[PDB]
Design a protein. Structure first.
Length: 145
């Protein structure tokens, strides 16, 4: 309950940093790995078992994005990976807490927009990530209540 909420607020903090770094692809990749580790902890606490499996799949997808970013420092595939994460978030919302489920679907929508922006604007993506961080912070607030 409260533990999972604290791990969500930590992810939001890491997303806000990523948005600021978008203006150092190597540093963002490291943060995405941290977010994946936090997602693994949330999955462990839940178990329940279905949502945990889906969160683990999202963690691996973020790891793939991180390895893709490290390769760029040394895009279209990242977009497809983000769309997969969105489809997984919507699946988690379908299982869930109606208010929290709606905030997840909204996060999935914004995640789809970021994927679209990757096809073409870096400033817009940073704003989208900050909106997602706010929505995650909101979900954590409902968990503590």
């Amino acid at each position: 309950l409260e533990e999972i909420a604290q791990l969500l607020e930590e992810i939001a903090k890491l997303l806000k940093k990523i948005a600021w770094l978008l203006k150092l692809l190597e540093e963002i990749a490291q943060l995405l790995e941290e977010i994946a580790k936090l997602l693994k902890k949330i999955a462990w606490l839940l178990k329940l078992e279905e949502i945990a499996q889906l969160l683990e799949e999202i963690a691996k997808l973020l790891k793939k994005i991180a390895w893709l970013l490290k390769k760029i420092a040394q895009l279209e595939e990242i977009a497809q990976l983000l769309e997969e994460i969105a489809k997984l978030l919507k699946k988690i919302a379908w299982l869930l807490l109606e208010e929290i489920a709606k905030l997840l679907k909204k996060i999935a929508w914004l995640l789809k927009k970021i994927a679209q922006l990757l096809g073409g604007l870096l400033e817009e993506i940073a704003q989208l990530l900050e909106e997602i961080a706010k929505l995650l912070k909101k979900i954590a607030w409902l968990l503590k209540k």
